[PDB]
């Protein structure tokens, strides 16, 4: 970059095969959520954050994938929308770029 400062590139094997879904719906459940993402990649672990008292899906969660490649496949299928709710997955990584490359299908 010329003006903006991007910085160096790091890998750090952490939250690679993880997928942070942003934009869930109080109705959205972990069961259905699993399959919804399972169609893309073998869901290993699905989590859906809920309220403290209401215990309702605030509007975000997580999704694990047997393979760290499954995450991308979905990131390319974006945007996303499950249970009549506009959602958007994330590689669970900080802003910036990655040397990953065109690696995708």
Swiss-Prot record:
Keywords, A to Z, come to: Acetylation, Cytoplasm, Developmental protein, Differentiation, Methylation, Nucleus, Repeat, RNA-binding, Spermatogenesis
RRM domain ranges (all copies): 17-99
- Report the locations given in the UniProt record: Cytoplasm; Nucleus
An example Gene Ontology biological process: fibroblast proliferation
- Organism of origin is Homo sapiens
The positions making up the signal sequence are none
Q: Name one GO molecular function term.
A: poly(U) RNA binding
Q: Where are the transmembrane segments?
A: none
**N-acetylmethionine carried by residues:** 8
Q: What is its main location?
A: cytoplasm
Could you tell me in which tissues this protein is expressed? Mainly expressed in testis. Expressed to a lower level in thymus. Weakly or not expressed in heart, liver, brain, placenta, lung, skeletal muscle, kidney and pancreas.
Q: Which residues form a coiled coil?
A: none
Lineage runs: Eukaryota, Metazoa, Chordata, Craniata, Vertebrata
Name the UniProt record assigns to this protein: DAZ-associated protein 1
One GO CC term of this entry?
male germ cell nucleus
Looking at the keywords, is Transit peptide present? Answer: no
Q: What is the recorded function of this protein according to its Swiss-Prot or TrEMBL entry?
A: RNA-binding protein, which may be required during spermatogenesis.
Its subunit composition reads: Interacts with DAZ and DAZL.
């Amino acid at each position: 970059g010329s003006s903006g400062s991007s910085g160096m590139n790091n890998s750090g094997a952490d939250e690679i095969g993880k997928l942070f879904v942003g934009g869930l719906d109080w109705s959205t459940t972990q069961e259905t959520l699993r399959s919804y993402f399972s169609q893309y990649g073998e869901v290993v672990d699905c989590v859906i954050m809920k309220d403290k008292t209401t215990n309702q899906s605030r509007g975000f969660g997580f999704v694990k994938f047997k393979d760290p490649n499954c995450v991308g496949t979905v990131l390319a299928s974006r945007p996303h929308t499950l249970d009549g709710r506009n959602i958007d997955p994330k590689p669970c990584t900080p802003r910036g770029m990655q040397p990953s490359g065109p690696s995708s299908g």
